[PDB]
Enzyme design. Sequence first.
Site, PDB file in Angstrom:
ATOM      1  N   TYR A 133     -12.106  -2.335  18.610  1.00  0.00           N
ATOM      2  CA  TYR A 133     -13.476  -2.143  18.157  1.00  0.00           C
ATOM      3  C   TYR A 133     -13.927  -0.985  19.042  1.00  0.00           C
ATOM      4  O   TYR A 133     -13.967  -1.111  20.269  1.00  0.00           O
ATOM      5  CB  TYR A 133     -14.373  -3.360  18.411  1.00  0.00           C
ATOM      6  CG  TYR A 133     -15.695  -3.231  17.680  1.00  0.00           C
ATOM      7  CD1 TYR A 133     -15.855  -3.750  16.394  1.00  0.00           C
ATOM      8  CD2 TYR A 133     -16.751  -2.496  18.230  1.00  0.00           C
ATOM      9  CE1 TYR A 133     -17.032  -3.538  15.668  1.00  0.00           C
ATOM     10  CE2 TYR A 133     -17.933  -2.274  17.513  1.00  0.00           C
ATOM     11  CZ  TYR A 133     -18.065  -2.793  16.233  1.00  0.00           C
ATOM     12  OH  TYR A 133     -19.210  -2.559  15.507  1.00  0.00           O
ATOM     13  N   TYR A 135     -18.430 -12.795  14.416  1.00  0.00           N
ATOM     14  CA  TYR A 135     -19.342 -11.984  15.205  1.00  0.00           C
ATOM     15  C   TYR A 135     -20.109 -12.849  16.183  1.00  0.00           C
ATOM     16  O   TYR A 135     -20.700 -12.341  17.132  1.00  0.00           O
ATOM     17  CB  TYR A 135     -20.352 -11.287  14.294  1.00  0.00           C
ATOM     18  CG  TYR A 135     -19.881  -9.972  13.740  1.00  0.00           C
ATOM     19  CD1 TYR A 135     -18.815  -9.917  12.847  1.00  0.00           C
ATOM     20  CD2 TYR A 135     -20.494  -8.778  14.116  1.00  0.00           C
ATOM     21  CE1 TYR A 135     -18.369  -8.704  12.345  1.00  0.00           C
ATOM     22  CE2 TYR A 135     -20.056  -7.555  13.620  1.00  0.00           C
ATOM     23  CZ  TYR A 135     -18.993  -7.525  12.736  1.00  0.00           C
ATOM     24  OH  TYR A 135     -18.535  -6.321  12.257  1.00  0.00           O
TER      25      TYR A 135
END
Length: 260
Positions: free
Chosen positions: A143, A248
Amino acid sequence: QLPISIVNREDDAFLNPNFRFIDHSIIGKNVPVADQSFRVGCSCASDEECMYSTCQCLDEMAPDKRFAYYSQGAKKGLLRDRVLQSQEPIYECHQGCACSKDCPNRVVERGRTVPLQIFRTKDRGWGVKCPVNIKRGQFVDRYLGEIITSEEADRRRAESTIARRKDVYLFALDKFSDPDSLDPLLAGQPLEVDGEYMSGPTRFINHSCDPNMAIFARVGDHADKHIHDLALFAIKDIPKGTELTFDYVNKISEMTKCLC
Ligand SMILES: [Zn+2]
Ligand SMILES: [Zn+2]
Ligand SMILES: [Zn+2]
């Protein structure tokens, strides 16, 4: 290196004109980084020794071939069920080690080895899928975004309109954060990566409470534990064409605051 495609068979939406894809993380000017002199690489004779308890790089992880990836067989090069289930940090080789780029313990470092497709889902926005099959414990990509301080991260949450959902694109590099000894550098608020305008394809993966992917912390030089990588691995077998998703939620408060 690997291509990224995009398709929208649902509506007239497209990527924002200001968004940009990056290959490496961008480091905020105020982000502290391990001093030159503290950097140390293992002195393994051959890329083969690095997978044993004697490799300097693995000198921080406990015992049970100690590295996190499988040796040979069907799951060679894939994350071990030990790590997958334990979620411990992954200690890899890095710039400095006496081994070669080919070191079996540089998989996250070696990068995304799979093509990815950003696609428009029927009614939940952009999503990400892969044209090839992904095996459980397989590394997909990191990420990425701009690495910033907690101070700056907090400012961004308190001063941006919620319409930007800064909360969705800020991820804290808090794997080794602990309110204790190690200087507030580890005792204080963690650094964060902001992928709102600059990120990799994983920024487009949707959230799901039953993900097939999950984030793992990968560490290069031990002196940079405060700026560890955010590496996404498949935690389930993902047949080509299946949407990738990560939790998330598992400062917011603040956010914004501032505004108111
Ligand atoms: Zn080594
Ligand atoms: Zn090493
Ligand atoms: Zn190595």
